[PDB]
Design a protein around this ligand. Structure first.
Ligand SMILES: CC(C)(COP(=O)(O)OP(=O)(O)OC[C@H]1O[C@@H](n2cnc3c(N)ncnc32)[C@H](O)[C@@H]1OP(=O)(O)O)[C@@H](O)C(=O)NCCC(=O)NCCSC(=O)c1ccccc1O
Ligand SMILES: CC(C)(COP(=O)(O)OP(=O)(O)OC[C@H]1O[C@@H](n2cnc3c(N)ncnc32)[C@H](O)[C@@H]1OP(=O)(O)O)[C@@H](O)C(=O)NCCC(=O)NCCSC(=O)c1ccccc1O
Ligand SMILES: CC(C)(COP(=O)(O)OP(=O)(O)OC[C@H]1O[C@@H](n2cnc3c(N)ncnc32)[C@H](O)[C@@H]1OP(=O)(O)O)[C@@H](O)C(=O)NCCC(=O)NCCSC(=O)c1ccccc1O
Ligand SMILES: CC(C)(COP(=O)(O)OP(=O)(O)OC[C@H]1O[C@@H](n2cnc3c(N)ncnc32)[C@H](O)[C@@H]1OP(=O)(O)O)[C@@H](O)C(=O)NCCC(=O)NCCSC(=O)c1ccccc1O
Lengths: 301, 299, 298, 301, 300, 298
């Protein structure tokens, strides 16, 4: 009775308005403030093409703007119908990679590429969306995480990994690519500079336990229980002050992210200020064309 | 006519017939668009719908390969008092305790009570910052509060000699932009002047701001968009690839890992163009070892 | 010709023992005046001066009815009529271990049992970190560490006739390798900051205003009057917004410390909310918190 | 004969001038250049109120200015006389927490709060004192380290922890609070971004060994020996060049702390320069109203 | 079982370096890998200024060798005096003066050229390793102490001898400090708590202990240390050299501020120079005509 | 009207083989003059030029009797009389792999077995990291990489009549994405720096002085005379303090590299102390060090 599949169909419901998804699935939990967002191209180890990225962005953006959702679980569906192989995500689909980047195609192969249309590298936009969203994103690595798939794991707030099937392999340099942003530099902020350089320069395959020991994986779970454990972590996150959780995420981001990090954290501080009687007096005085009266509000130190 | 806008020079854009708070035009000849606040009756204050329209329009420009430069400005003058404005920031009428709120009308009476406020002009700031194209702010009048902060985050600023007025009113109404509006202003005028601008909230002219370092050039009001178009033409006459890389180089360190992500992203694209990268792709697809021998190690 | 208007200022409780510094509170406004009081040596500071200055600024920091600090120098010199804001560390009591405590004014009375100090750096941080605007009124010479004190203040107003900026550090084998130099570059740019230190030339108020280190130039007799006006414009705004803005300006330049100060004020803002009060109450009442009344914002 | 208490009364003497302390204890070692600074409210798991913070600052400042002291051991007294429970520090005293921060009170409970007096969050001032003092501060975690107590451990230079009784738990978001400075961001500089995020977002309880494995605890010690081991570490620190140790602490702080970090490190470099004949010639030339003669001093490269 | 990691059959001397005294320099007989090693095992491979000069010269030559992808940095041994093993024990204290480490005609302080100021220019070697567009693997075959420990830290990767590696940061014991890559950058490997412990207490750590803390990538048997180094180098050399170059500079970038940006952006400029668009910019200038950018799309 | 005064400068031993660069030491002062010597092509540099420039600057770095470097360009052009500081990389030998070594002046003598290089970046770092002030004397056109060299120098003086600043990078499909651009913004601010690169307009000495990238404007004939005066003011200060100050200005902008350089100078200062000597002596004498004479400063 041991399931080879982490997905419990009884626990999840399709989100309204997303019937047209082909490369991604999107579910909301039947009880919890948690959604499940998953790659749905297991025949190519869940490699993403530009359409995949567009769907992924659309889905994550919707989750971001859903007030009754606290946590995103990002994972990959499977296994491959071809060989039963398991994957989180193997990065950009090499079949439609051109000299200008990953290209839109009418089919799955290079011969169907729209030659009039420039390639894109916009999984980077999805990276920023994950980074900047005021909600915890937990990567559930259920299989291979390679290339840009590895880098997506890196930029998520937390990572849980399948004991049996998770395999971490940074294959970028093998195919003449590189993620010189969050995939590499930010990995060093998890495992340190020596281990991060080893991971990219040699491109070896690592287990869930090895990545846990190095600092890039928060916990290892049994494959069949990976989403169950993800849901437990999500519930612990959702049981705290959502205001504090939001502020904490942006505090962790801040200095690493320079002025952008400051912008996001300060933006949340501005919102906190808007809630105060003092900010309301500022608004009211402007609207009423009168001098503001700040006397009720002390100079804290 | 003392209006900067030359109707004959601009054309409407497919898909934007529904715009109400913003106007969007593409130049008749040039690789340049004109994006403008269109609520001059309230000094071009933005409400959340304005922000949505502005984001949509700028995102469209970003994804338009035949467009190299964005001119960001405000329409005018006010039909009520003839006052000129670039943008006076967030519309205070619909500001609530949770931020700026959606409303069916122009005033607080019609705010959707079930819907939390937003501060998402910050998303527009990031869109301007991260887009691989030069954004020139044309300050044609009052630039106050969040309007002032939009001017600050733009790559370049041209301002009307007669009518541009820079006034950072944030602290007057109990608000603050603690990101690009303040800290990034200091990277233009220095810390002393930036602090003065915010702490005292005085009104400055185009010439004064040019002297401090936040305004690139001062133009006659009637000529502001003509000068903007000339600046755009000089930008568009250079290597688009070089211009792209330069913008992200200027952003990089100030923007930390995000800046690195954007610049490195462009470097990845440059690498994908190489025969070496194509060999990496081909070897994977052909299930064979790559042959790197033709590609020398540079130093 | 003196910038000081005695009628506008009152003494402060608990500071009757001050010798090197003066400290006044404005008669009407939420503004204090903090001034070097050693004009016979161009207002050079000794370690006792630094201790007094720290004490006074800390007091102003903790005074809820004070919004703005005017930092300046008294004068003129009774000996030659020269005007000074501050000429930096008192070289008379400078030793190999830094500036030394002495019972008198010269090296003759240095306490041998006591190592030297460079703790004007503590005053620089106090100015930097305090949630109130500090305006330097440069009424005369600003040299060495006195020049660096001007640099670290939020704003600077300067006497047209008598302000003289001269970074003499390298002339006497010293250097401010922190706020005095690197932060000067964040005001006038790297080229001008390097020029100011490497050549140590004398600059006027107008020249420094042109470079970006002086906010405005005022007539000498009006310097404190103009300072009070600036203070009044500052004090007419939201105290909360002003606090947040100062820390936002500091933040990234100050790394984790800047984040600590800014995030600290964000924490205070959070504590004011009903959501934070429920967190407190639930803990005190030994029950689970109920977060359902509080929407997730985006 | 196994002691339940790490404190060895025979090894410590009260510091003169501190008879009025109520919330904090302060001892100097009978032989070593080491002091012991401890929370003294074990009945509420060594939670600090604003008076506690004032005493803590006073004591740490005195240690800072004591030239015959090289190392500070920061710990908590105990156990609770109520239930025998052990704590390092449980953060801000929630009983006197109000909308403006932690408030001064005449008693221990909310009804004795001076309502006319604004609240403070000035444990942040103690964090900076620990960070900026030119001496090594070793946290000895002898029990619960929760909330602000956890953040104090994080900002110390080194941490040793009780095998049996140390418990690390970041409860901030549970009570709607957050440390968005050293408590969170700087924790990431010890355990990496993934683990730091886990510690705050889930607020689980961790053992000494778990925190040691993640990188936030330097070593685990037997509870009875925790202060003995702390003293041994202090003795190894005090056996080296005090000048080098000072420069090293500020080197470690420097870049994480931006211009403030630079100020502190450059300030010590200025001190080193003042010791030189070249600097003395600069002083002498000024005092003697003559040009300086730099010819005896070679340019180095 | 060999007590020595060095396999003489696998290495050939590099031409032009027969005058080296304090350093050895070999090129692998088959691989794109060089071996650069301290050669003063009688004093635990402590470096003097001449050592630093030779080391810089050799590393600079490897940097400028297009047929070399990886540098293995290690120490020769054992000591003929006592059979002790060292990677590098840091600056030679015998010729340390008040102005830094001084050039000397001999081994001892009495042979120091007093007219010539001291230097601390192992820092120049640290920068050379940091900035070179090739992976440098430190093979810690024995003691790594003081400045020798800091060299280990600045390398891209470190492999260490199970039996003989010993890590000990003795700086503060002799009144010295590396307040740059040796300390601050160590914190970027093991975290701030462990890095502070390493410097403030100066304890000796094993290869396994440093591996657990995050400063050592892997532990190898002493006899196999260079064999494993060569295997790691081969894995590195089997990838796109262009990608490896960009990755190294991406890892350096933000930690290294504007200098990091300069190096990464430099490589980006090189990539741009390869494009037809860049060639059109050049051609238009040379041909005294306006450039035509119309063939080159804007990308987003 | 030539800025160069032949009677004031002497050749440096060991450099009679220079072809693209000239190198002189002042006959009286602790100052050297390093100049581009290809005025027929507006002083564009080829890889050999960069090699010579590095060699000469490195020699100046290691010369204890030299405190200041004046970096400039020789002229005028013998062909059209035009003046140049430096017009950047020589486009005649620019290839897809960078600037190429050639035995002659054009692409037809390029050695193809030799990959192109962009190693003016190495010279930029050498200028940045050398513990001496480098003053750029812009005597004419400063364009492309020549403009970026001006930017990275500590100070810039410029010819009123003939200095012309023009960032032509994007015009020829190139870009300096490091010190040339990002660091320019640390002198003139982000708006002006973006303007300079994105539009590539020509600016005068006075315009660049007003923006913050030129320290002072001088008459063309007096440009080196003024440079020597600035050098003399620099050389009249504590060389130790000047060294520390340069590295303090560099530090945070240069991250860990900045820290490495500044901390390295701090280590040297510590080595001078009796305390450090005791540490050395105890190790050499195989005995415990005695730190008791050395107080714990605060
Ligand atoms: C902009 C300024 C200085 C113009 O002065 P003036 O020439 O006197 O125009 P006037 O004040 O008469 O305003 C003209 C009309 O437009 C309205 N109006 C102007 N600006 C408005 C605004 N933001 N919201 C709503 N109505 C506005 C006015 O209420 C007035 O309406 P009526 O009298 O005809 O009924 C002067 O008008 C001014 O100071 N406006 C306020 C600028 C401001 O403070 N905005 C918010 C600051 S903070 C911010 O923008 C922000 C936003 C998002 C996030 C963070 C933020 O900090
Ligand atoms: C400020 C300046 C340029 C004024 O020059 P001048 O107008 O000609 O006045 P004068 O130089 O005659 O000074 C008037 C009297 O005050 C003394 N005096 C002035 N400044 C003094 C000072 N700092 N310390 C002790 N006595 C002082 C003078 O020795 C003189 O005394 P008498 O002849 O009447 O007996 C000119 O006075 C000047 O250059 N002063 C020195 C500027 C300076 O070098 N400050 C210290 C640099 S290092 C520093 O400040 C520092 C300290 C701690 C930490 C970091 C640091 O960088
Ligand atoms: C510390 C902890 C985990 C221990 O739990 P446990 O071992 O089960 O004991 P218990 O929870 O029963 O507490 C024992 C007694 O001490 C009180 N107590 C413990 N900590 C207290 C505290 N901070 N304030 C007031 N009373 C306290 C308790 O209320 C209880 O009192 P009685 O029932 O005997 O009457 C568990 O007690 C716990 O979770 N404590 C709270 C940790 C916490 O949330 N601190 C504040 C969070 S925010 C913060 O620390 C902070 C502070 C300043 C600035 C920024 C900040 O984020
Ligand atoms: C390396 C270490 C820990 C090994 O100790 P051990 O295995 O017990 O052997 P021993 O200490 O007897 O040393 C063996 C022989 O080599 C000499 N030796 C070893 N290292 C030396 C060194 N650096 N300088 C001169 N002679 C050395 C020794 O003096 C001894 O010679 P003899 O008694 O046979 O005549 C043990 O030897 C040790 O602790 N070495 C000290 C490493 C150190 O801390 N050096 C300077 C600190 S600062 C630094 O390293 C540095 C360097 C460059 C730039 C910046 C820097 O901060």
């Amino acid at each position: 009775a041991l399931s080879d599949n982490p997905f419990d169909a009884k626990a999840w419901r399709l989100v309204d308005g997303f019937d047209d998804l082909t490369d991604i699935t999107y579910h909301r939990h039947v009880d919890d403030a948690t959604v499940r967002v998953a790659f749905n191209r297991p025949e190519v180890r869940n490699a993403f093409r530009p359409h995949t990225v567009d769907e992924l962005y659309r889905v994550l953006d919707h989750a971001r703007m859903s007030p009754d959702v606290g946590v995103v679980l990002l994972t990959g569906n499977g296994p491959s119908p071809k060989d039963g192989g398991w994957a989180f995500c193997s990065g950009g689909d090499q079949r439609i990679r051109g000299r200008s980047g990953y290209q839109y195609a009418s089919g799955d192969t290079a011969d169907t590429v729209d030659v009039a249309r420039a390639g894109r590298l916009h999984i980077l936009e999805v990276q920023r969306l994950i980074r900047f969203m005021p909600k915890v994103v937990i990567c559930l690595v259920n299989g291979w995480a390679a290339g840009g798939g590895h880098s997506l794991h890196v930029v998520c707030d937390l990572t849980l990994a399948s004991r049996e099937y998770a395999r971490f392999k940074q294959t970028d340099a093998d195919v003449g690519s590189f993620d010189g942003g969050y995939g590499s530099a930010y990995l060093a902020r998890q495992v340190g500079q020596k281990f991060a350089r080893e991971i990219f320069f040699l491109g070896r395959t690592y287990t869930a336990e090895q990545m846990h020991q190095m600092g890039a994986v928060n916990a290892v779970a049994e494959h069949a229980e990976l989403e169950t454990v993800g849901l437990q972590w999500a519930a612990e996150i959702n049981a705290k002050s959502p205001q504090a959780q939001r502020m904490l995420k942006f505090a962790f981001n801040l200095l690493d992210d320079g002025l952008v990090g400051q912008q996001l954290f300060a933006g949340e501080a501005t919102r906190l200020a808007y809630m105060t009687d003092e900010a309301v007096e500022g608004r009211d005085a402007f609207l009423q064309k009168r001098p503001p009266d700040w006397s009720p509000f002390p100079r804290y130190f």
